[PDB]
Design a protein around this ligand. Structure first.
Ligand SMILES: N[C@@H](CCC(=O)N[C@@H](CS)C(=O)NCC(=O)O)C(=O)O
Ligand SMILES: N[C@@H](CCC(=O)N[C@@H](CS)C(=O)NCC(=O)O)C(=O)O
Ligand code: NA
Lengths: 217, 217
């Protein structure tokens, strides 16, 4: 089976878990636990990090036979090729490339704020940036079934995970965009995703590592 | 003619310009200039930002026929797809995917320090971090001619641009890696590339925007 290495948090492995479950891949998770406060000890990973044959050692990682990957985007693209979940037309590939990159920008915009000691003073400002962030995703999807079009795609896993993080922070932030509200429901209604969510394997939280000012529990 | 729109700096358009040149593409540049002083003025851009039909308005952007892209990586993937410049085996595709995301993290590791108001304090600490990053690239390249193997890939343009930016900051940072020194020479020796970097167009600098603490010219 595949090995997904990551911390015992949700973080950048959420979309990879969802794609591994959607695609029915045979995987196990190699879980690393970060020590508690003052130190936030990483030696559970730091002692294995250079012993795994990885080119740029990092978390998450994916071992699949002879292939060892880091970088979650590279990992999603690797599973997506295995199961033909990449764009088919030029227009699809452009939408998939733009949204994958835009989704990481959108994710880090919020992670910069939570990982910041000034979280409480930046939060009112950040809250007011959220509707315009969400309107961009809303208009991009339009009346499409999935973000790249009719066919589901790995970027839908990224868009689902990033849009899900925002509504956990601001629960009303999708209320004014029904096509996004509906895209989330249709994503959670997929048979193998819904089964996964009703299983013990599902890890809802923490969203971030222990030292973040939000989503650390 | 395709249009590449970006600020009047090097920045995230450097690898895109290079790849437009190597592929011999018909492009013109829409150049936005920023104000000096306090209030680094952005009106030249912000007056057009939502009038270009970009789904996620941003710089850089690429216009080409009906296709209107933002996000530098997605722009490069687009130009590369057009001229058949991405991986073909599964192994090359993984190396391209891993390095592309890796190159952006390495860039942002450097960009965060230079734009930080405390750059002067964190300068020496970041410098002792550089040899370890370069060892990672050197070991990844190995004895390969290019970074995904035998044929030139758009990721070689990212790796060239990121390694060069480190080279300028720390001129001795490649010395213990003939590997990468050879690679920079081999890349600079590409025929259409050299015709361009000897040109007066060639924007070797400013690396960053005017408000960075280093690389703003
Ligand atoms: N761009 C990378 C980010 C990697 C990253 O930030 N990893 C964090 C987890 S949130 C880490 O703790 N890495 C540990 C290390 O590299 O030693 C990706 O997509 O995977
Ligand atoms: N992740 C994006 C970054 C986009 C970005 O940061 N653009 C900078 C230029 S260095 C900017 O100032 N954009 C202005 C804007 O968004 O209006 C990419 O790779 O293209
Ligand atoms: Na299904």
């Amino acid at each position: 089976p595949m090995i997904l290495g990551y911390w015992d948090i949700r973080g950048l492995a959420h979309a990879i878990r969802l794609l591994l479950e959607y695609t029915g891949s045979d995987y196990e998770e190699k879980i690393y636990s970060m020590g508690d406060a003052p130190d936030y000890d990483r030696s559970q990973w730091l002692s294995e990090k250079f012993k795994l044959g990885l080119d740029f050692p990092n978390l998450p990682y994916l071992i699949d036979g002879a292939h060892r990957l880091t970088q979650s985007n590279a990992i999603l693209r690797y599973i997506a090729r295995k199961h033909n979940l990449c764009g088919e037309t030029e227009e699809e590939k452009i939408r998939v490339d733009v949204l994958e990159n835009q989704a990481m920008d959108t994710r880090l915009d919020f992670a910069r704020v939570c990982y910041n000691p000034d979280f409480e003073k930046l939060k009112p400002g950040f809250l007011k940036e959220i509707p315009e962030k969400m309107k961009l995703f809303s208009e991009f999807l339009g009346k499409r079934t999935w973000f790249a079009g009719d066919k589901l795609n790995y970027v839908d896993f990224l868009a689902y995970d990033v849009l899900d993080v925002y509504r956990i922070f601001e629960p009303k932030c999708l209320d004014e965009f029904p096509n996004l509200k509906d895209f989330m429901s249709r994503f959670e209604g997929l048979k193998k995703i819904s089964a996964y969510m009703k299983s013990s394997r599902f890890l809802r939280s923490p969203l971030f590592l222990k030292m973040a000012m939000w989503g650390n529990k």
